[PDB]
């Protein structure tokens, strides 16, 4: 296997508009949502068929109970942070927890909270501490670091339970998460203002890809414009790399994807 990740997000709004929930929580394996929960439905539901098919109803029931509790905690903590900041109106509170299982088998884990879209508290599971960004976060850090058993629980979950869940979900979605769809790559020429070469790749999975241009085969050219890796909508992804050419060189597009190197030389 390659590097995979599992992570859960929580989001809370203080004065939500009628169409916006007060609390949302979504889980992801690498880039696919697998779980979802909001204050409107008050139920944890699958976001992938291989999650609903391979999980008994008891799982969803118990984690729905847990998510109701977590939503309540989020509401209280957001109100407390607004009280500390002397803030009124609508504000956002976010949490992300997760882990990564790499190619060489090593594991990483992370947990953090944000207030109004900015890092608020970053958990360090090696030193068993919380990094605080301001004084309010320092108050919350003093509050949380007093509960040693909770820090130990967080360490054990990030290092042991999260990786177990990741492997279990990977086996659940083996035909989706661990498949390989090779890209289709083409070369276009466009007239600007001069002529430019576009290397367009599309229809591939996983999203991670590398594209570049090279002149005379041995040197990487400069002033390369890169297109973002965007979801095409059918589960595959697309991207591109363009350069501008006036001198007579031999240019070639190089695309590396999922351990396969591809070279398109253009005349």
């Amino acid at each position, epitope marked *: 296997m390659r590097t995979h990740s599992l992570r859960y997000f929580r989001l809370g709004v203080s004065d939500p508009i009628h169409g916006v929930p007060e609390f949302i929580s979504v889980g992801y394996v690498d880039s696919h949502p697998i779980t979802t929960y909001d204050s409107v439905t008050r139920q944890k539901e699958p976001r992938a068929p291989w999650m609903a098919e391979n999980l008994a109803p008891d*799982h969803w029931e118990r984690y729905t109970q847990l998510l*109701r509790g977590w939503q309540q905690m989020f509401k209280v903590e957001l109100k407390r942070l607004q009280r500390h900041y002397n803030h009124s109106g609508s504000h956002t509170y976010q949490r992300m927890i997760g882990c990564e299982l790499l190619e060489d088998g090593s594991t990483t884990g992370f947990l953090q909270y944000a207030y109004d879209g900015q890092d608020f508290l970053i958990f360090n599971k090696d030193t068993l501490s919380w990094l605080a960004v301001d004084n309010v976060a320092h108050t919350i850090k003093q509050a949380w670091e007093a*509960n040693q*058993h909770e820090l*130990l629980y967080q*360490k054990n979950w990030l290092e*042991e339970e999260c990786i177990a869940w990741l492997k279990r979900f990977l086996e659940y979605g083996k035909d989706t998460l661990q498949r390989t769809e090779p890209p289709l790559v083409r070369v276009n020429r466009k007239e600007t203002f001069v002529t430019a070469l576009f290397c367009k790749a599309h229809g591939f999975y996983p999203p991670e890809i590398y594209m570049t241009w090279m002149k005379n085969g041995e040197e990487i050219v400069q002033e390369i414009d890169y297109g973002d890796i965007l979801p095409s909508g059918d589960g595959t992804y697309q991207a591109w790399a363009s350069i501008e050419l006036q001198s007579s060189n031999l240019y070639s597009c190089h695309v590396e994807h999922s351990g396969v190197h591809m070279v398109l030389q253009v005349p």
Partner: antibody
Amino acid sequence: GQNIDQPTEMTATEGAIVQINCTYQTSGFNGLFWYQQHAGEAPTFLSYNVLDGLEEKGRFSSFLSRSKGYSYLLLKELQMKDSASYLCAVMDSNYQLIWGAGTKLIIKP
Amino acid sequence: KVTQSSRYLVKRTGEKVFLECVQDMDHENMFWYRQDPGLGLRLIYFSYDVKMKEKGDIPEGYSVSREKKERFSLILESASTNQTSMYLCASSPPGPSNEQFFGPGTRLTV
């Protein structure tokens, strides 16, 4: 299924050492609790173990081995007041607190 | 800290029994266990906060109400002979690693 096995009864003399084992078989692990409960009295928290190692709190020690899925509560310099039941509780991957039947410790004077 | 109703109670079958659990520790989570011989504690009902109640492992024939934060009432709608047990309640702050504080316990023979 998921169950927690600990001895039903243990007997040791006063001033000696006793080791109350607790082995658990669960899908996932989120911590193991130890509780002391005298007969007819409220259970009382003793220790919480979630990482491998031995924790010493007074005369009581709590060891955990996640690999072996096993723990033991160590009582040193046993006293007559230590006569009580000791409860083992493990939390599984679904955050469900499984409670063991308990171990009735008897101290011989 | 955590207190309950009378430690002993004699009730006839078919009666509506009210068990109480009061804690002054401003705790959110409150629990109701029953302790039977040869078995560990078994969760009957569990309340995360006020006006919040989730069924436990054995909620059949049991009901609860969490109106005040300090008070967690356990309601026995139709008393049965099987409901003869040692009833323990507990309170604790939110968190999977936090210990619970139990009340004195209530022995109910039916």
